[PDB]
Amino acid sequence: NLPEHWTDMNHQLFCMVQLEPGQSEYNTIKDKFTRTCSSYAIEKIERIQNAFLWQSYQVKKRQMDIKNDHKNNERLLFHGTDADSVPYVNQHGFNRSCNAVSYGKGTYFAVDASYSAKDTYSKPDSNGRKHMYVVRVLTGVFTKGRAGLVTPPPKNPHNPTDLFDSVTNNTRSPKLFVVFFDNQAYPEYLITFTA
Amino acid sequence: NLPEHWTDMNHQLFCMVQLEPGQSEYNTIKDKFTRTCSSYAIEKIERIQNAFLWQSYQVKKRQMDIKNDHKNNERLLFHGTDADSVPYVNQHGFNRSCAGKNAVSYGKGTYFAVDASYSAKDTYSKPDSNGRKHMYVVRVLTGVFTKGRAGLVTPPPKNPHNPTDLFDSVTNNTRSPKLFVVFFDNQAYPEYLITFTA
């Protein structure tokens, strides 16, 4: 069940598709980035078409939608990473086993591209090229994180196995989310940019 | 896609089903266990019916079967654990982030034994305060594997010039595997819980 906006992959399961500047899709993703990173220079935006990662993610989304009894479990967030991690993320997505982990040992996603645009995350390569993903994240029901978490806390100590879906720095006004399971995040776009 | 011989869970997503001795399903597991654990005695064998873990695992299995272009990707292995871990595993499966360092480490992942005798060690299946030991019987997507190394946080690449094309798992010995390490969620389905005692 591959999304309508994907382009044909000639019976293959993985493609990075460079977006056409000035078309609706490129404009939408560029605007999400320029909301907070208007001082940067965008080289390109690529759509990540990874059928396997999409499949596993959509299964987790369906499960979380059932568990939480609503379809408000997904957020579009940003993730800055170094060039050497990009091939791994494109093919395998986010891996907590691979910076600070102040809110738990998971994968960190920013509400604002400006946070992910920090050199500590989107490490500039030899040429100053920086890499940021636009990510579909199953944040679901979240709570405040803390150092040393390996999974989200339980929603009630009385049922230790019924967990929050993610944690954040601040429940009232979140700026970051941490997820602790594979296939809770789908890397949808890769932005290549410079300061 | 839930298996047709599972008990009806009346829209519930999770059930543990106590098996009857003399049923083929119980006897095959008891035989697999007693092959190497004949000094122990089984209290009970429970079938783990976890709809969400099954769905995610079967998706991974289909993907691995496609990628590897054969259906030799799944092994039935053992996993000894402490009583405090059983509720988590039943609900959420095997979390590498919680895994102990193995006394012989072939990587930082979840370990599964070919032989029940390995998993039966008190170091894994820690006897609880009532002397009950706990061992899972696990469908594991071992796929294509290589000898592991203690530094691994993912399986190694098949080819160093293509670092993202990975082995599916690692082992202690490719010619005579006795343990497998997996590094991803939903690569192992806890199918049965064996409760046993000395």
Ligand SMILES: COc1ccc2c(c1)sc1nncn12
């Ligand atoms: C407080 O810890 C982190 C750690 C990593 C991280 C953030 C915050 S925001 C962001 N964007 N990409 C990566 N990250």
